[PDB]
Amino acid sequence: ALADVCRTKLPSQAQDTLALIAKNGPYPYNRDGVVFENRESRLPKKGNGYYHEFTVVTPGSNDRGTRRVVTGGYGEQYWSPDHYATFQEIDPRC
């Protein structure tokens, strides 16, 4: 299954990304908001265009890095630190 994480426990930069999503941007990267096709079936299987991805800034890097938020069509939020290898469900109540 997928673990749960409280929004308040995420890194500051992830919380910043959730806030920007809620504001509809403007986003820092051209690939912010592109469809995530869920090709490994790590998230619940849904129809085409259900999920979108957003970058979580990593200072540590010079590139975009590997840290992402994925949103679903009814406002579900997921955290991945490792370019979609691992996901946790984000509990916004939390």
Side-chain angles (χ1 to χ4, degrees):
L2 299 183
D4 221 80
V5 62
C6 282
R7 188 265 303 165
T8 54
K9 304 288 150 126
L10 293 171
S12 62
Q13 294 95 350
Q15 293 189 63
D16 287 352
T17 296
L18 296 181
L20 265 190
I21 294 164
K23 283 167 185 229
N24 172 48
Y27 301 103
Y29 301 106
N30 290 125
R31 278 184 69 78
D32 288 340
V34 157
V35 169
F36 174 69
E37 288 186 53
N38 185 37
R39 292 221 98 198
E40 313 174 301
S41 297
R42 299 205 197 270
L43 295 181
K45 294 189 234 169
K46 301 284 172 190
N48 291 36
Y50 193 91
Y51 297 111
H52 303 261
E53 59 121 308
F54 305 80
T55 312
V56 172
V57 176
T58 295
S61 304
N62 21 75
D63 83 294
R64 241 157 100 238
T66 61
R67 301 201 301 172
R68 301 290 185 271
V69 170
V70 173
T71 62
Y74 287 104
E76 299 99 320
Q77 300 161 156
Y78 305 88
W79 167 238
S80 182
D82 54 7
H83 212 289
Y84 317 123
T86 307
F87 285 101
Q88 290 176 135
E89 306 175 339
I90 298 170
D91 189 347
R93 287 129 64 248
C94 222

